[PDB]
Subunit: 248 residues, 2 copies
Amino acid sequence: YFQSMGLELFLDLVSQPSRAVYIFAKKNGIPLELRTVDLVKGQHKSKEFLQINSLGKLPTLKDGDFILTESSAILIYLSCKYQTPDHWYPSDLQARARVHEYLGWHADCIRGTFGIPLWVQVLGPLIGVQVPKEKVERNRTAMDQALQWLEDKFLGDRPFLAGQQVTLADLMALEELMQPVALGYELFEGRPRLAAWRGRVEAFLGAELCQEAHSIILSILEQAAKKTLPTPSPEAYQAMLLRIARIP
Amino acid sequence: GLELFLDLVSQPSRAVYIFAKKNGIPLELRTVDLVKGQHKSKEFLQINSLGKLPTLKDGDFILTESSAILIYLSCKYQTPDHWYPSDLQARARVHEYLGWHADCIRGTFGIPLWVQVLGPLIGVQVPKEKVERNRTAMDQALQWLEDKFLGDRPFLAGQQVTLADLMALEELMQPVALGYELFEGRPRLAAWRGRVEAFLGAELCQEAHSIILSILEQAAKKTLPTPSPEAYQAMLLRIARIP
């Protein structure tokens, strides 16, 4: 409800696109007031938050009167407004097209697929709901196919997903792949090219930045096990039920 | 010369087709028959390994994803600013819609074609429970489109037609073409469609929508091609991702 003097970012580091924007702002030293909005508790569906963003999704950027959603949109906005190093989002027509191509494919094949293990293992059981085994198997196969395409189409024999340098594409991809990794799905094993890529991206980001970005997600399974997670609000419950029923 | 590989039965294919035609961008149009499975053939997999439409080929440079294609074409051919405004916040609004679209529209609004035509074509019924869940999901997404994106503004991302309106319209056309009259009872959405279609022109709209608008009749009359085994495989995978 209350604001800081400038740029506010409403986020929860349990969320993949929140972590992507967090990392981008931190790495570029973009001065940003972090406002934590607790997803599990349901604070993104609170009256106060819906007043800011009627969609009630994270991350949300507030720049004065200007309120903006969608990590890709937020990332591009900040990169321009703050004139970040070119490699992140290259001016070059074709190099930029490669970043947009990845982002488009990501929205389709990664987003909404790689997050599912959190629902299976933590969030569903948290409200008494099990994800059927057949769906879990389907999701695992879907993840493996997507990693194969990630390796073959995008990475190739190149250092990063959209060319010779780290772009927004790499940031988005990593934070999504981190979700199953944090729950004990070791996605990089048996995938040497992908493993090398991760090492490359994380080396660039810095160990300390990666640590603080990934801290929450790396502890969530254990916190769920010790039953220290918040009880979802009725609004969060409703949204959770809908999300779970969207698992194919 | 540029080539566009496309099939007008497909929503993102139509969006790119419309943008190019409205802007007079000279493209070699190359029809790739999706139902037959030409997108999964060796010759096309040799061009786009992902075997997905639309695909744009610019000499050596091969590009997929309608959003990426649209942006690329807009900069390459320097189309009128309004399609993709250079203004920081106007542009962010376009990206914001496109991202939300990929999550809430793309993959949801196409489902009735699978229910009514494509599934039955290969002996697969979509369970009623999924059909009803999909209908509810469409209605919820339409509500966000009206309340959050349009509001009382003329278009989805501001005062003028942008890439956002093109993608939205072509996705919404899919259920419409299959008998879901979803602009009924939703004045803001109906007015928006009227605005977008008036800007594009009746002939371009007619040309873009002709194929999808005749697909139910083709299914009823049983004149649709038999899918290749590769198409069949992909169809089963797509049907199984309906929740």
